[PDB]
Ligand binder design. Structure first.
Ligand code: HEM
Ligand SMILES: O=Nc1ccccc1
Length: 153
């Protein structure tokens, strides 16, 4: 696919749809995660000592929102420039993941959780062309953070 002017136009459009409902899309995202892997729960300070995923936890929202924003930015950056650029932030991200005890095999958990989350977000406008575009953008961004973890470990 590569990321045509037409494919990028498709990710932008679909991210705008995600941000449009943070407390929902972020809580959905945590549940998809715990469905794909339950053990993940002990990781999160704000999930530990709980029984269910808190729904109005500021910490949870702020944090999951940041995740999706980062994947979208990555897709534009691919169409324009042809690449995903590693900055200060991506590097600090890599540190904190390691402290919290997160590994690589965790990443397809959060990917499927995100493709499924975006399929649920765009509904009928879904195309092969679009799936192809988010997949390209996640893959390309995971490649970068995993890189920074390994570096923090
Ligand atoms: C490209 C994919 C990913 C992106 C863009 C991403 C992004 C982030 C960001 C931005 C934060 C810090 C939020 C804050 O300090 O304000 C964070 C924290 C965290 N992330 Fe990720 N992440 C990704 C994949 C993963 C994976 C695969 C896991 C493992 C299940 C994970 C587990 C965690 C945990 C445990 C924290 C600490 C939360 C705390 O205890 O309060 N992340 N991530
Ligand atoms: O996947 N990374 C996450 C970031 C912040 C909170 C929870 C998860």
């Amino acid at each position: 696919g590569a990321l045509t002017e037409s494919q990028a136009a498709l990710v932008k459009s679909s991210w705008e749809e995600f941000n449009a409902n943070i407390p929902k899309h972020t809580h959905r995202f945590f549940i998809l995660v715990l469905e794909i892997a339950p053990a993940a729960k002990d990781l999160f300070s704000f999930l530990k000592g709980t029984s269910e995923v808190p729904q109005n936890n500021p910490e949870l929202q702020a944090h999951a929102g940041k995740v999706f924003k980062l994947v979208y930015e990555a897709a534009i950056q691919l169409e324009v420039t042809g690449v995903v650029v590693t900055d200060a932030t991506l590097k600090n991200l890599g540190s904190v993941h390691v402290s919290k005890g997160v590994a690589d095999a965790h990443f397809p958990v959060v990917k499927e959780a995100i493709l499924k989350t975006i399929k649920e977000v765009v509904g009928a406008k879904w195309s092969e062309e679009l799936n192809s575009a988010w997949t390209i953008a996640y893959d390309e961004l995971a490649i970068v953070i995993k890189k920074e973890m390994d570096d923090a470990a």
